[PDB]
Amino acid sequence: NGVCIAYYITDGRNPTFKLKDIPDKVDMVILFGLKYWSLQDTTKLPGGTGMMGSFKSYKDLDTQIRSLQSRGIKVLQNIDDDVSWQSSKPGGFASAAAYGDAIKSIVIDKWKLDGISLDIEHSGAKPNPIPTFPGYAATGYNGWYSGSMAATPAFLNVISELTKYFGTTAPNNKQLQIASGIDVYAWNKIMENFRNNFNYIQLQSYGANVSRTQLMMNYATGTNKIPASKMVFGAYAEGGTNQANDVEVAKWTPTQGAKGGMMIYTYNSNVSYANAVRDAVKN
Ligand SMILES: CC(=O)N[C@@H]1[C@@H](O)[C@H](O[C@@H]2O[C@H](CO[C@H]3O[C@H](CO)[C@@H](O)[C@H](O)[C@@H]3O[C@@H]3O[C@H](CO)[C@@H](O[C@@H]4O[C@H](CO)[C@H](O)[C@H](O)[C@H]4O)[C@H](O)[C@H]3NC(C)=O)[C@@H](O)[C@H](O[C@H]3O[C@H](CO)[C@@H](O)[C@H](O)[C@@H]3O[C@@H]3O[C@H](CO)[C@@H](O[C@@H]4O[C@H](CO)[C@H](O)[C@H](O)[C@H]4O)[C@H](O)[C@H]3NC(C)=O)[C@@H]2O)[C@@H](CO)O[C@H]1O
Structure with missing residues (x-):
């Protein structure tokens, strides 16, 4: 019985399925697409358009979020890694501490959200060497995802600062999760440093079967030393073609022990698909 984490991309797709329509047996919802800078300054992106396409206005967004929380569903904000994380001015802030405070100020202080999930895969300087x-045999992936970036010290500082307000060691029960892949350059160093800070560690294993996820599990646990209970696999509902496999992964208990659960990308892309995965990881 793992967790069921639902991604809700706010780009207006399948509009009748509102954020508040997230069904039961879904533990957390991660607002995705929408950027934290829109939560920061709500006047730049008009509601009902772009990454606010899913809502009539910011008030509508705010109301639906509460609708989920009052039902006990945690709502997290997706935060993407960015090449600025490798600089001394992450997010254009003065330092990683400043960046961390800002995220905390916007996601928690202002929007009273339950945490953040880091989508780690964006471009930046590659590691060197x-x-x-x-x-593949060792990780479930063929080689590096060349479009990701190195977890340089500056990059690590960002996450470190974020762990002060999000994650297992932060106060006020705030979630800190990550959605990435063993193939992203920054993976290993992120886990060497923060695997214990993450409540859940999601692998974007879109389109995988149980065999491939196990391969990933072998590495994540054996080499990255990640507790099996944090591992979450990706159900690619957006694709609409890998449900049977996703359902099997959802029901599956890795040889290393019970996994954290499944995340669904995205629940609102295909609700029936998502419900099947939810049902599978829950029952
Ligand atoms: C966890 C995970 O799975 N990770 C990724 C997945 O995210 C990824 O799935 C795709 O995700 C896209 C969203 O990505 C953006 O948001 C995430 C989360 O914040 C970011 O991580 C990601 O990088 C994208 O954000 C990008 O951020 C950067 C900066 O932060 C922006 O760049 C800056 O831009 C400014 C300009 O202002 C400036 O130039 C700066 O210099 C520059 O740095 C960048 O703009 C921004 N990118 C975006 C997209 O905003 C989804 O969009 C994507 O979904 C589309 O594609 C999939 C294919 O896989 C399709 O299945 C799907 O249907 C969809 O198609 C689009 O659907 C929408 C839904 O409605 C349609 O919208 C409609 O559009 C109409 C006009 O065309 C009307 O507006 C209408 O009202 C509206 O509803 C749209 O038409 C469809 N068109 C397209 C694009 O096909 C998918 O979910 C996966 C797969 O890649 O990879 C995982 O690893």
């Missing part, structure tokens, strides 16, 4: 990727 680039290590030899272990390979």
Whole structure:
């Protein structure tokens, strides 16, 4: 019985399925697409358009969020890694501490959200040297996802500062999760440093079968030393074609022990698909 984490991309797709329509047996919802800078300054992106396409206005967004929380569903904000994380001015703030405070100020202080999930896969400087990727048998991936970036010290500082307000060691029960892949350059160093801070660690194993997820599990647990109970796999509902596999992964208990659960990308892309995955990981 794992967790069921639902991504709700706010780009207006499948509009009749409102954020508040997230069904029961869904533990958390991660607002996705919508950027934290829109939560920060609500006047820049008109409601009902772009990444606010899913809502009539910011008030509508705010109201639906509460609708989920009052039902006990945690609502997290997606935060994407960015090349500015590798600089001394992450997010254009003065330091990683400043960046961290800002995220805390916007996501928690202002929007009273339950935490954040880090989508780690964006471009930036590659590591140097680039290590030899272990390979498929060892990780479930063929090689590096060349479009990701190195977890340089500056990049690590950002996450470190964020762990002060989000995650297992932060106060006020705030979630800190990550959605990435063993193939992203920054993976290993992120886990060497913060695996224990993450409540859940999601692998974007879109389109995988149980065999491939197990391969990932072998590495995540054996080499990255991640507790099996934090591992969450990705159900690619957006694709609409891998449900049977997703359902199997959802029901599946890795050889290393009970996993954290499943995340669904995205629940609102195909509700029936998402419900099946939810049902599978829950029952
Ligand atoms: C966890 C995970 O799975 N990770 C990723 C997945 O995210 C990814 O799935 C796709 O995600 C896209 C969203 O990505 C953006 O948001 C996330 C979360 O914040 C970011 O991580 C990601 O990087 C994207 O954000 C980007 O941020 C950067 C900066 O932060 C922006 O760049 C800046 O831009 C400014 C300009 O202002 C300036 O130039 C700066 O210099 C520059 O840095 C960048 O703009 C921004 N990118 C975006 C997109 O905003 C989804 O969009 C994507 O969904 C589309 O594609 C999939 C294919 O996989 C389709 O299945 C799906 O149907 C969809 O198609 C689009 O659907 C929408 C839904 O409605 C349609 O919208 C309609 O559009 C109409 C006009 O065309 C009307 O407006 C209408 O009202 C509206 O509803 C749209 O028409 C469809 N068109 C497209 C694009 O096909 C998918 O979910 C996956 C797969 O790549 O990878 C995982 O690893």
